Amino acid sequence: MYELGHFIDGKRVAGTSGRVSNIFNPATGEVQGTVALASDADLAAAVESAKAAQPKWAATNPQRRARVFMKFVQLLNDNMNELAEMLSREHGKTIDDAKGDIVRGLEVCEFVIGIPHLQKSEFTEGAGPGIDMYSIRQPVGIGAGITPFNFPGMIPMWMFAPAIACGNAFILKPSERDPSVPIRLAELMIEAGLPAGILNVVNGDKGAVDAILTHPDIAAVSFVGSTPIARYVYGTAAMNGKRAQCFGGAKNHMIIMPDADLDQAANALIGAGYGSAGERCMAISVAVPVGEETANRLIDKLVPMVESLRIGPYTDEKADMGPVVTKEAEQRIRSLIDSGIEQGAKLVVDGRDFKLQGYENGHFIGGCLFDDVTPDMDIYKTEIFGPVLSVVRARNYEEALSLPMKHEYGNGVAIYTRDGDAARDFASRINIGMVGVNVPIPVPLAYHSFGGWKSSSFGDLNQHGTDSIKFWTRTKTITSRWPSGIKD
Amino acid sequence: MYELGHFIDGKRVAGTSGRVSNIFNPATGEVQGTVALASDADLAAAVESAKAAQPKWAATNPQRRARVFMKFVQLLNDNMNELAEMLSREHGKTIDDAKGDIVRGLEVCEFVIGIPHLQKSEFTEGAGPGIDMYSIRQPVGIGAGITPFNFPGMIPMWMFAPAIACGNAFILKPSERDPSVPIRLAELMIEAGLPAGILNVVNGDKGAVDAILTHPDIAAVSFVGSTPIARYVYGTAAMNGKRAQCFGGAKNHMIIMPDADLDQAANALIGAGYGSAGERCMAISVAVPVGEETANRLIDKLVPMVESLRIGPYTDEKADMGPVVTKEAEQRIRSLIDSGIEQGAKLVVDGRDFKLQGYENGHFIGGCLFDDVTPDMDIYKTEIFGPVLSVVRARNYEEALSLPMKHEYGNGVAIYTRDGDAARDFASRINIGMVGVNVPIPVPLAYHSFGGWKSSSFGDLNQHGTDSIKFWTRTKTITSRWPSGIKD
Amino acid sequence: MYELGHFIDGKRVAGTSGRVSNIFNPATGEVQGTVALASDADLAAAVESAKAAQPKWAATNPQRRARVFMKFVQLLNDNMNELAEMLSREHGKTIDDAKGDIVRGLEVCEFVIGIPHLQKSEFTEGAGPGIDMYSIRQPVGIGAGITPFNFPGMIPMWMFAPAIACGNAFILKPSERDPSVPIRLAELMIEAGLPAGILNVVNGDKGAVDAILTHPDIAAVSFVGSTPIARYVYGTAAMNGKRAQCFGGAKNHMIIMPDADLDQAANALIGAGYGSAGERCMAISVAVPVGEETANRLIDKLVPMVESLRIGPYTDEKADMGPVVTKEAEQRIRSLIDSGIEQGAKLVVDGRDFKLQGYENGHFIGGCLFDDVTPDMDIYKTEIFGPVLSVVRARNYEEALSLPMKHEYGNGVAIYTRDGDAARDFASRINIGMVGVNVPIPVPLAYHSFGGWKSSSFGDLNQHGTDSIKFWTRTKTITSRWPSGIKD
Amino acid sequence: QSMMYELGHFIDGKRVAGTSGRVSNIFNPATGEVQGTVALASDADLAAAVESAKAAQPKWAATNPQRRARVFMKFVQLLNDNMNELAEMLSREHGKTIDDAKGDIVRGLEVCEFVIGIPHLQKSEFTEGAGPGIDMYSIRQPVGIGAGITPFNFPGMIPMWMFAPAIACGNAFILKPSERDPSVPIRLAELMIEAGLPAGILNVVNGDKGAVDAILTHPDIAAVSFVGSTPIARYVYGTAAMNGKRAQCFGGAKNHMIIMPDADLDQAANALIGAGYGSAGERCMAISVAVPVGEETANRLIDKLVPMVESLRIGPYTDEKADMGPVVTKEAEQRIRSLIDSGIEQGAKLVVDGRDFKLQGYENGHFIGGCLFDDVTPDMDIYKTEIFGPVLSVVRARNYEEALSLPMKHEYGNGVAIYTRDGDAARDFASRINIGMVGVNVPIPVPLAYHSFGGWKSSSFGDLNQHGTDSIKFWTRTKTITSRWPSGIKD
Numbered sequence A, B, C: 001m002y003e004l005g006h007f008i009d010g011k012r013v014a015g016t017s018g019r020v021s022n023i024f025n026p027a028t029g030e031v032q033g034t035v036a037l038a039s040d041a042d043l044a045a046a047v048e049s050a051k052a053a054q055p056k057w058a059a060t061n062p063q064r065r066a067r068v069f070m071k072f073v074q075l076l077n078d079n080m081n082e083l084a085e086m087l088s089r090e091h092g093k094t095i096d097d098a099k100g101d102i103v104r105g106l107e108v109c110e111f112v113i114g115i116p117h118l119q120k121s122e123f124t125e126g127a128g129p130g131i132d133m134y135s136i137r138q139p140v141g142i143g144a145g146i147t148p149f150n151f152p153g154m155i156p157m158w159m160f161a162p163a164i165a166c167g168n169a170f171i172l173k174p175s176e177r178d179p180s181v182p183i184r185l186a187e188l189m190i191e192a193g194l195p196a197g198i199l200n201v202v203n204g205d206k207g208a209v210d211a212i213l214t215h216p217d218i219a220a221v222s223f224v225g226s227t228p229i230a231r232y233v234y235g236t237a238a239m240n241g242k243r244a245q246c247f248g249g250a251k252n253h254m255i256i257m258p259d260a261d262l263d264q265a266a267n268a269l270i271g272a273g274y275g276s277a278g279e280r281c282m283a284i285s286v287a288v289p290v291g292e293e294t295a296n297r298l299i300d301k302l303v304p305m306v307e308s309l310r311i312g313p314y315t316d317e318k319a320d321m322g323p324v325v326t327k328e329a330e331q332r333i334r335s336l337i338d339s340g341i342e343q344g345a346k347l348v349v350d351g352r353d354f355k356l357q358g359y360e361n362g363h364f365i366g367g368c369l370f371d372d373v374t375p376d377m378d379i380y381k382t383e384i385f386g387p388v389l390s391v392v393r394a395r396n397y398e399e400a401l402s403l404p405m406k407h408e409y410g411n412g413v414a415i416y417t418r419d420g421d422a423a424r425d426f427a428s429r430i431n432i433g434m435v436g437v438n439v440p441i442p443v444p445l446a447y448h449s450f451g452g453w454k455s456s457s458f459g460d461l462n463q464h465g466t467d468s469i470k471f472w473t474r475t476k477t478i479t480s481r482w483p484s485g486i487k488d
Numbered sequence D: 001q002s003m004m005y006e007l008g009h010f011i012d013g014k015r016v017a018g019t020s021g022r023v024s025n026i027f028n029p030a031t032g033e034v035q036g037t038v039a040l041a042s043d044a045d046l047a048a049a050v051e052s053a054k055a056a057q058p059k060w061a062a063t064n065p066q067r068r069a070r071v072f073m074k075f076v077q078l079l080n081d082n083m084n085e086l087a088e089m090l091s092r093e094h095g096k097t098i099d100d101a102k103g104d105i106v107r108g109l110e111v112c113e114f115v116i117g118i119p120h121l122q123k124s125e126f127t128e129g130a131g132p133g134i135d136m137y138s139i140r141q142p143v144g145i146g147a148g149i150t151p152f153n154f155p156g157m158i159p160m161w162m163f164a165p166a167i168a169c170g171n172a173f174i175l176k177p178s179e180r181d182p183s184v185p186i187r188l189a190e191l192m193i194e195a196g197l198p199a200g201i202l203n204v205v206n207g208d209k210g211a212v213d214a215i216l217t218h219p220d221i222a223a224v225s226f227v228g229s230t231p232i233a234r235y236v237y238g239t240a241a242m243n244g245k246r247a248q249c250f251g252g253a254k255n256h257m258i259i260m261p262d263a264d265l266d267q268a269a270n271a272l273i274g275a276g277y278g279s280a281g282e283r284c285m286a287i288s289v290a291v292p293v294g295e296e297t298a299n300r301l302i303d304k305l306v307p308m309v310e311s312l313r314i315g316p317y318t319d320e321k322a323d324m325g326p327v328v329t330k331e332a333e334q335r336i337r338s339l340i341d342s343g344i345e346q347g348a349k350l351v352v353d354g355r356d357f358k359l360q361g362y363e364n365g366h367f368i369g370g371c372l373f374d375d376v377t378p379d380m381d382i383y384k385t386e387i388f389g390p391v392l393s394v395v396r397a398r399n400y401e402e403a404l405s406l407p408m409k410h411e412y413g414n415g416v417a418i419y420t421r422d423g424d425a426a427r428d429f430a431s432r433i434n435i436g437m438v439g440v441n442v443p444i445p446v447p448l449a450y451h452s453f454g455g456w457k458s459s460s461f462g463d464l465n466q467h468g469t470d471s472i473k474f475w476t477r478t479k480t481i482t483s484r485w486p487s488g489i490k491d
C-alpha cells in the first residue's frame, strides 16, 4: 500500500487534512494505495509557494525557460517505461495507450520550447508624430488547472507546459483516481531545472477545486472533464473574477458515405470506438452509415472485429482493451447498456457477460455494439464513456449531417468519403470544433489547438497552440514619446 | 419631445414593454425625450431577426463584407456634424469631444476593412503521412454588446465592427442615458449596404441586459461600464455558458519625475484631468509628482489653468468642458469633493460655487484641484468620474510607482520623465494594462488592443485589434486524408 | 492623335528625348497616338522628385497613408467606365475584361488600407537581463516597377499599392503598348491626396528599364513580363545590388480526370483558353484529358463553342474576345499555328481564316483548337499568348501529372476531378506555384499572394499579400538597455 | 610542421577525400606553422554532393515537421556534450580564445533551438469562402537544395545560421565553409548524422572560388546564402541571380559607437574594450569607431581607454587567461599592419601602439598588440576601411547631429550603438540611422536566433535576413491552392 501526498516547493509532502481517497487497481478491483485530499490550508501553502517563486521565474529570459522544457522532454523519454507502468496500473489502459498519453503531453512540451518566438508582441513606429506604440505579453501570475482521470499525463502537460513557459507559476489539481503520474511529472520538472514552487501538485476532490476557484491570488483556471463540472468551474471561476477555459464531454459521430473505403472505416471504428475501453472525449460513440447497403456492409465487417477484441489487464501486453476506471463507471455503463435494450435498440454484439479468469473482480466490460439506435434513446443522448458503440442508420447525406449538428455535444466528428465535395461541405457546415476527413480521432497536434463547440467547451481560447499562449499571458500596451532634450 | 424605440430588422420600431426612461439635456437639466426599455418580446424579435440574417451574411465573402465598412466610414464622415450634435445634446460633452468619440469608432471600422487578412487561419501539410491539418475561423453566431453613457459612438463601434466583419450578427444594448447616436449608427449601416437584422439595437436597463445574458441563442457578450456591473455581467454571462469580455472602472495616475518636461506634464494634466468633465475611464485623476520642487512647480502651473477652464453647453464652442450627464452623477461628485475637504486634503482650486447664467439647472461643476491627497482618502480610492484632480506627493521613484501598483484599478497609467531607465523600468513593472511614456491617455489605436488589468477588466481578450477577431470567431480544426482511389 | 508624356511630381510632363513610340488601336490596326520614351535625364528627374518627397511621406502615420488608398478606391469606382474605355482602346480586350483588370488592382489597394496592421514588427521584453529587443519595418526608400501590356491597370497597382503604403516612393515604367491607364492612375492618386513625387510614371522601352536598373538611388525593382526579360531584369538588378522580384511566362495545363464534370470543364476551358484572346500568363493553353473517352467527349463539347466565339472590337459590347495587341504578336501566333500543323497536330477548329467586316486591318485571329499535341511540339513548349488551345491526351493520372511537372513553365495548373485523393495528391506534388482544384484560373486574391515556380518567377517574395510588405520594407532590430539613473 | 591532419569533404554521411589532389594549408595562428591541409573541391566533388542531396531530400521532405524538429533537439544535446572538443578544434585553427569558441558554437546552437519550432514556424494561411463555395490556402514547401558559403571568423555559428532553417524546412543543404578553419563544419555534419539526420541532407564541400562557382552555376541548387566580405557578397549575389537562384548575402562593417555626454562613461569604456578587441577585432559586429560627443566626453573616454588597451592579455588558445589571440593568417596580419601605418602617415594620433608586441615562444604567431587612434577623421583609410584587426579609431564629434552623420554617411551599415541616458536621443537616433542593427547602451547589438540578422547599405544584399522568420521565408517557396467542388454524391 502506497500513500500519495502533494508536491510542494520541490518536494513530496504529506499535507495536513487528515483526509484520503482510495487508489484502485481496476484490473483486480483491489485498493492499491491512498491519495491525500487537500484542505484549504494545504492549497494556501501551495499558493504561497508559487507566489514566492514566480517573480524570479518570470525574470528568467525566454531561451532559458525553454531549456527546462528541452531537458524535461529527454527526461520523459528516459522515464517512459516507468511512467507508463504507473499510469496503466492506476488507470487500467494498456502500456501502449499509456505511452501515447505521455507522448502527446511531451509534444506540448516540445511546442513550448519555441516560447521565445511564441511570446513575441507587436511594435508600431510612428503611430503618431515621434510616438511609438507596442505591446508586451506578460505572465498572468499564478494559474491553476483541473484534470480528469483518462489522461493523467497528457492533459496536465497541456496546461502546465504553456503556463510555465509563459513565466507563470502553476497549481495542478489532478484526478484523484490516478495521481502517481502528475506527482512524478512535477518531480521530473525539478530534475529538468525548474525552480521549486513553479509547478505544485495539489491532490484533492471538490474541496480543493472550490479552494482554487475562490483564492484571490489565482488569476486563471483551466479545466478538462465532464460537461456538468466544466459548466460549474467556468461559471464559478468567472464569478470570482478569474479567466477560465473549460472543456467538456462528447458524443462523437463518424459518418460513412456510400463511396468510402469500408475496410478502413471498419478498422477506424474498432480503434476509435473501443480504444481505452471507450474512455475518451474523442472516442467515436456513434456510427452513421448513409444508406442501407453501407450500414449492412459496414456492420458485416465491424461485428467480427468487436467480438475478437482481446480484453485484459495492463500486465498482458497483447490485450487491446483494459478495464474501466472504477466500479461506479462500470455500473453506470452497464445501466446505460440495459436502457438501450429496454428502449428498442438491437444489441448485435453483447459484452455484458464477459468475465476474465483470475480477474473476476476487475472492472471489465465486453465490447458492445448497438444497431438501429435512434436520437430519442438514452444511449444516443448520453456520453457513455465505455466500450459501447451505437449505429444510427441515416437515409441520406443531409440526414447524416443533421445528427451531430443537432447533438448537445460538439467535440469531434468524422466523415469517411472519397468525394471532395461531400468532405468540404460537411466540414464547412458542421457545428463541431474538431473534424476528421477520413480521420476517426481528429485531435489536433500540440502546435495547433484543441477545443470543442456547443456544450463541449466554455470560454474563448483553446488548449495548447497559440491560443494557450494567449490564455496564459496578459497584454500590456505602451504608447511612448519623448520631449526634446540634449540632442538639441 | 422625441420618443426613441429600438432598431430591429433594418428599421426603427416602438418598444412593447410600456416602460420608458427619460432623456435629459444635461446643460439645461430638463427632459428632452424618452427611450423604450426593451421587453422580452423586443429582445426575442431582435434575436429572431439576427437568426434569419446571419447565415447569408456569414456566407458573403470577406472582401464584400469589408466593402460595407468602407462605405460606412464614408457615411460617418458625411454625417459627422449631425452625429456630433445629437451626441453632445444628450451627453453634455463639447462638439469637438463628440467628433473625437465618433472618429475613434470610425478607426475600428477602418481596421476591420482588413478582415480578409485578419480572419486567416493556419495550414500544415503533412502533419502526418498523407495527412493535412488546418483550422478555420468561423463566426460564433449572434453576439451582444453592452455599452456605457460616456462614449455612445466609439464603444458600440469597438464591438460591432469586428463582430459583424467576422460574419456575426450583433445586438447592441447601449446606455439609456444617450441612445440617439446608436440608433443612427444602425441606420447608417443599413445605408452602407448591411443586410437588415445584422446590426440590431435594443434599448433598455437591467431588464434588457438580464434578458441578453439568459437568452440561449446569444453566444458572446462584450461589456464596457463600471467595475461592479462588469463583475456582474462577466459572472452571469459565464454562469449561462457564454463567452464574455468585460471592461470596468479606473483611477489613472500620472507619475511626474523631476527631470520631466513640466510644461508638457501640466498641459497633459489639464487635458486628461478635465476633458469631458473628467467622465472617462482613461481620465487622469491622480497626479503623482516626485519631490517637493516638482510638486510645487506643478501646482504653480496647474492652478491658473484649472481656474480658467471655460465651462458651458455644447452650443458654446469655446467651452473646454460641459456639464455632467445627470443630477445623480453631479450629486455623487459634489459629495466626494466634500469628503476630500472633510478628510484633510487641500482644495487649491474650488469649483463648487460655479454657476452658469441661463443654465442654472444644468449639471455644471467647476474644475476642482486637491493637493496633499493621501491613499486613505475617499477621493483617492473612489473613481469620481468628474472634474476633480488629486495630487499625491511622492518622495521618490519607488514610493511613486507603488501608488498605481497598489491601487484596486489598473486601467491606464502614465510616467513623465526624460530618463530611459525610469521609463523602461516603470512600464515593465507596473501592473496596469495601458502605459504612457510622456503620453497622458495611452489608449491604443484601433489596430492595437484596449484593456486594463486588476479590477479594470475581466476575461482574456481585449477590445479591438487582433484580440477582437479572436473573440468574435470560433476555431474549427480539420484533419484530412484520403484513401487510395481512381488516381491509382 | 494624342501624345502621352510622363507623370512626374504631380504633373503630366513632356519627354525630353524627342523619341516616341506608336500606340495602336489593335481593333483597326491604325496608329492612334504616341508615347514619349524616357531618356536617362527623364529618369533622373523622376528619381530626384521621389527623393525629395519620400521622407515627408514616410513620416506620415500609417492610418493617414491608408486613408489615401481608401479615397483612391472610391475614385476608381467613380472612374470605372473611363478607365476601362481607355484600357480596351489600347489593349484590345473587352470592356468587361478591362473592368476586371481595374477591379483586381483595386483589390490590392483595399488590402493595403490595412497597412497599419500589416507593417507591425516584433517585440521581446527581457531577451536579456533588463534588455529588450524589437524590430521596426522601415521603407526601402525608392522602388521601381516594370509592367507588361496585358494588365496595364492591375499589375501597376499590384506593385505600387504596397510600395507606397509602406512609405516608399515609386517609379512605374509601364508597357509602352498601352500607357493611358497608368498615367491616369497616377493622376487619380494625386486626387486621392498622395503627395506629388510619391508615384511617378516614366514611359519608355529597354532604355528606361536599363536606366532604372543602373540608377544608384533605386533600392528595389519589381517586374512582370516574359521569362527572357524577367531573367535579364533579375540578373541586372542584382548585379547592381538591388533587391528584386521578377515574374515570367506560363504554359498552364488543365488536367481533366475521368470523373470530372465535363460540361463545367469544357465551359471553363473556353473562358480560360480564349478570354483576353489568350493573352494571359494564367490562361489555360494545354488541356490534358485522362483516358480516351474523356478526350473524345471533351473535344466534342469544345469544338462548337470555340467555333461560335463572338469576335469584335471593344465597341461591340456583345463580343467574347477582341484582337491581339500588335501585328508583331499576330504574326508570332500565326507562325506558331502553322508550326503545329506541320509537326503533326490535328487542328480541329481553324481560326486562321477569320476576317471581320470593316476591321480588315485589325489584329484579329479566330479561336484555334489543336488535338493530338505531344510534348515535343513547338505549340506545346512555347507560350503562344494567343487564342490557341492545345489538347494532350493522357493515358493515366501519373502521365497527366508528369506533363505540367516536366514543363519549364510553372505558373498555374488546374485539376478537374470529384476525387479528394487525386485532388490533394496532384496539388501537393506539382512543382507549380498556383494550383486550381476545379478552378481554371487560380489567381490568388490580393490578400494572398501571386507567383509561379521554375521559369515563371525569380526571387524569394511573391506579388501582393504579406510577401509584398516584406519586399518593400527593410528590417531594423534594436537591442536596448539603460544604465542605473535617477530612479535610484 | 609535425604530424599533420588532412580534411576532405563530408558527403552522404561520411568523410571522403577530394578527387582534385589540390589542397590548402591549415595553420595554427598561434605558432604560424602549418598543422594540416584541406581538400579543394573539383566540379565532380560538388556534383557528387548535389547528387547525394538529390537522392535524399524527397524522403526527408516527406518526414513530418515534429520528427524533423527532434533531429535538432538531439543535435542541440550533442553540441553540449561535445562543447569542449568543438571549442578546442575551432580555437586551434581560428586563433580566438576557448571561451570565444564556445560562444561561437552556442550562438549556432541557439539557431538549432529556434528551428525546433519548425512545425509552428512553417504554417501557411487558410481562407474559407474566398468566393462562393471556394477556399483559398497556401503551403510552404521546400525550395529543394540549398547551399551556404561561410567566412573564417565564425565557422560554427554561421554554418548553423544557414543549415538549421534550411534543413528544418525540408531541404537538403550543401555547406561550403572557409578553408581557413574547416574542422568544426565537418564535425558538425558528423554530429547531425549522430543526431539522426539522413545521409546526404547536410553535406560539406571544402574549397575556394572554384567550389563557389560550381555552386553558383549548378542548375539543381535553388538557393544560396553567403556571409563574408562585401566584395565577395556582391559577386555571390549578382552571380547567383544571374543563374536564376534566390540569394541573400551579408557583407562587411565599420560599426560606430556614439557616446553622449550623459552616458555612463565607465560602462561605455568597458564596453569598447570588449567590443573593440574581442576576437582581436575580427568581427563584422566589432566596434571599430568610437564617437564621443564634445571635448570633455572625448578626453575622459580616451583617458579611460588607454590603460585598458595597454593591459590586454594576449596569447594562444592554450592560455585561458588571454583576452585576445593572434589574427587568422599572415596575410591578415600584413594588411592590418599596412592600415595601422596608413593611420600614422595620414595624421591620426596612435595613443596606444601595439606594433612592437611579441610573445615569447610564439614569435612566428600572427600576434598584434591592441592599437588605439585618436583624432581620426572621415577621409582616412583607417576610418573608411574595415580593418578586421585589433584597431580602434576615435572620431571626435562636436554634437548629436554631427555624431549621427558619421555612421549615416558610411558605406557600411551593419551595426551601430548609442550610449546615453536620454530617451529622446536614443529613440531619435535608433529611428533615423540607416543601419540594420542598433544598440541602445548595448555595444554589439547582434539579434538573438528568434529575431533576425542583417545589415543595410553595403552590409547586405537581398530582401531576407538570417535566422528568425525571414530564414523560414528564404528556405521555402509558396504554393497557393484555390479549391471548389461540383455537385456530387451528397446530392
Ligand SMILES: NC(=O)c1ccc[n+]([C@@H]2O[C@H](COP(=O)([O-])OP(=O)(O)OC[C@H]3O[C@@H](n4cnc5c(N)ncnc54)[C@H](O)[C@@H]3O)[C@@H](O)[C@H]2O)c1
Pocket (backbone or CB within 6 Å): B146, B147, B148, B149, B150, B151, B173, B174, B175, B176, B204, B205, B206, B209, B210, B224, B225, B226, B227, B229, B230, B232, B247, B248, B249, B250, B279, B280, B281, B282, B383, B385
Ligand atoms: N471609454 C471609457 O471612458 C470607459 C471605458 C470603460 C469603462 N468606462 C466606465 O463607465 C462607467 C460610467 O458609465 P456608466 O454610468 O454608463 O456605467 P454603468 O456600469 O452604470 O452602465 C454600463 C451599462 O450597463 C448597464 N447597467 C447599469 N446598471 C446595471 C445593473 N444593475 N444591471 C445590469 N446592467 C446595468 C447600463 O444600462 C449600461 O448599458 C465608469 O465606471 C467608467 O470607468 C468608461
Ligand SMILES: NC(=O)c1ccc[n+]([C@@H]2O[C@H](COP(=O)([O-])OP(=O)(O)OC[C@H]3O[C@@H](n4cnc5c(N)ncnc54)[C@H](O)[C@@H]3O)[C@@H](O)[C@H]2O)c1
Pocket (backbone or CB within 6 Å): D149, D150, D151, D152, D153, D154, D176, D177, D178, D179, D207, D208, D209, D212, D213, D227, D228, D229, D230, D232, D233, D235, D250, D251, D252, D253, D282, D283, D284, D285, D386, D388
Ligand atoms: N558575424 C560576423 O562576424 C560576420 C558576419 C558577416 C560578415 N562578416 C565578414 O567576413 C569578412 C571576413 O571573413 P573572410 O575573410 O572569410 O571573408 P571572404 O569574403 O574572404 O570569404 C568568405 C567566403 O567566400 C569565399 N571566397 C573568398 N574569396 C572568394 C572569391 N574571390 N570568389 C568566390 N568565393 C570567395 C571563401 O572561400 C569564404 O568561404 C569581413 O568582411 C566581415 O565583415 C563577418
Ligand SMILES: [Mg+2]
Pocket (backbone or CB within 6 Å): A263
Ligand atoms: Mg482495400
Ligand SMILES: [Mg+2]
Pocket (backbone or CB within 6 Å): A308, A309, A310, A320
Ligand atoms: Mg487483435
